[PDB]
Design a protein around this nucleic acid. Structure first.
Lengths: 48, 141
RNA sequence: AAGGUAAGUAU
């Protein structure tokens, strides 16, 4: 609480399931386009 | 699947293999009624015009023409084999069987690349060529 | 159990 300079609540954060699915689909897309892709490019896409 | 030329006896297959001196003789061993053979024959039909400069495609029924079943181990629903100047050109597909393509492909460019690699290797005088793509896995994700 | 065959030419 800004006015009283005291804590009053707690936000419990959590990653949305839609973003989970987006990341999983990104990894699936990276893995699928890897027949001719080099190891360095795959790992770079993973890291990014 | 039905638009491709057909060979109706073993002598015709031998002559087709012998006749072509400058092109790869791609012969599919199977049955026009087998779904795997239908897929493979559709793929071969889609590329038949494209590769006509360096490849000729024939279809052989292994029941009508059983003269190569024991020889070439044609005991699979579909089988594609490559011959160049009366020599069977093996290909290292990574599947453990380097003599034939015993499954059905889905990409025209894949089959065209394999045909081109076989053509180049056989022109250089090689009995085994390495496929540009490995097939130890189906790349399914 | 496999996806791990060099393609040969000679004897």
């Amino acid at each position: 609480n800004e006015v009283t300079k005291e804590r009053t609540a707690q936000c419990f954060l959590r990653v949305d399931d839609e973003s989970m699915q987006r990341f999983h689909n990104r990894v699936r897309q990276i893995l699928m386009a890897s027949g001719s892709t080099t190891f360095t490019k795959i790992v770079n896409k993973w890291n990014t | 699947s039905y638009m491709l030329p057909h060979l109706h006896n073993g002598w015709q297959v031998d002559q087709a293999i012998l006749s072509e001196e400058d092109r790869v003789v791609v012969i599919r061993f199977g049955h026009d009624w087998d779904p795997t053979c239908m897929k493979m024959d559709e793929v071969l039909y889609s590329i038949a015009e494209k590769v006509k400069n360096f490849a000729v495609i024939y279809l052989v029924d292994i029941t009508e023409v059983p003269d190569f079943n024991k020889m070439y181990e044609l005991y699979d629903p579909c089988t594609v084999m490559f011959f160049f100047r009366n020599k069977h050109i093996m290909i290292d597909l990574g599947t453990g069987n380097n003599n034939k393509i015993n499954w059905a492909m889905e990409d025209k460019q894949e089959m065209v690349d394999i045909i081109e690699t076989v053509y180049r290797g056989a022109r250089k005088g090689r009995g085994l060529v390495v496929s540009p793509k490995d097939y130890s896995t189906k790349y399914r994700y």
